Design a protein around this ligand. Sequence first.
Ligand code: NDP
Ligand code: CA
Length: 327
Amino acid sequence: KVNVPNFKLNNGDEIPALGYGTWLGVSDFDGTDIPKLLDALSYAIDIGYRHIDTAHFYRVEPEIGQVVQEKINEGVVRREDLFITTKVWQHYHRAADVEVSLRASLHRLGLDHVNLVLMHWPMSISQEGVDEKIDYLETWRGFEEVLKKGLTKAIGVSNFNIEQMKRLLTNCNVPPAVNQIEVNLNLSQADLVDYCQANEVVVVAYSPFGTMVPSRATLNSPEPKLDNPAMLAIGRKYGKTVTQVNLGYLYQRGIVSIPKTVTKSRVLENASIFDFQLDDEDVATLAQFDNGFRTVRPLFWQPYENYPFDVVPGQDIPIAMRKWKNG
Ligand SMILES: NC(=O)C1=CN([C@@H]2O[C@H](COP(=O)(O)OP(=O)(O)OC[C@H]3O[C@@H](n4cnc5c(N)ncnc54)[C@H](OP(=O)(O)O)[C@@H]3O)[C@@H](O)[C@H]2O)C=CC1
Ligand SMILES: [Ca+2]
């Protein structure tokens, strides 16, 4: 029903250009919508989604793996058709711990291997908020170890800045396949994106709607909002909604998107974005929305070594970002 194209990774594998996000939010982690997430996942797989993005931190690996196993039992997919990502959090940054974190995630998900595993953030932080000051290069030796053990078909990073990427690419034995980071119309990350793509690292955009959608549109957050006349106008021109223009723009930059939704019509809508070329004029308009506004800026991590973003001077990590139970 939907046909999702694939980008090629620097390790020979394919990654679908759109994936299904599974984080429900600290909006106190909110488990209420788990059933809707699962039912919208099952529907996503029925219509042709294959890429699923998840993480230890998202609490729901056991439930995702159950859905996956059901879809395989029903004959809708084989394992080999799916691209599944998970991620290792900040308390498992010693080299030997990557294997423990990932084997556990793999047990939760019910899998022999994932397609991709990421270093969720470059900071090394204990469960009590101690900065363990472990170099991400040491952590990366563990990613390289779990790769050689066949626990994952690919290794990557998330929230690495251009400096961290450069240092990682200069020192690694196996390069990262992806850098997963925030990209949207207000935060284009042009330089980081260009640097990644010049080095054959694929960029995967989380929070691809930024503050455009009403769930995140807090006042004085920037345009575009869903009513934006220029967005709507670009919409009418190619026969698309505003969210579809947004995702198609990212697609057209060669960037993979992982929107999140619990709503089946959005699942379907989000995937109908591969049949239009935005022209030079509309690209230039869309580029004008870029203004450095970061939707996801966890100020509690500023003091840690390897915090990746620019520090706002003059500023306790909540418990839900350090300790939790799964399933
Ligand atoms: N590596 C990292 O550090 C991070 C990774 N992520 C990952 O990426 C995903 C990224 O998305 P996220 O940050 O959740 O935010 P998104 O930009 O995906 O937006 C989520 C919101 O958009 C709404 N929505 C989705 N589709 C549409 C549509 N077509 N029209 C109108 N509204 C829509 C949803 O509503 P509803 O659900 O009610 O339909 C939801 O409230 C996460 O699920 C996770 O997988 C996220 C943050 C950090
Ligand atoms: Ca498997």
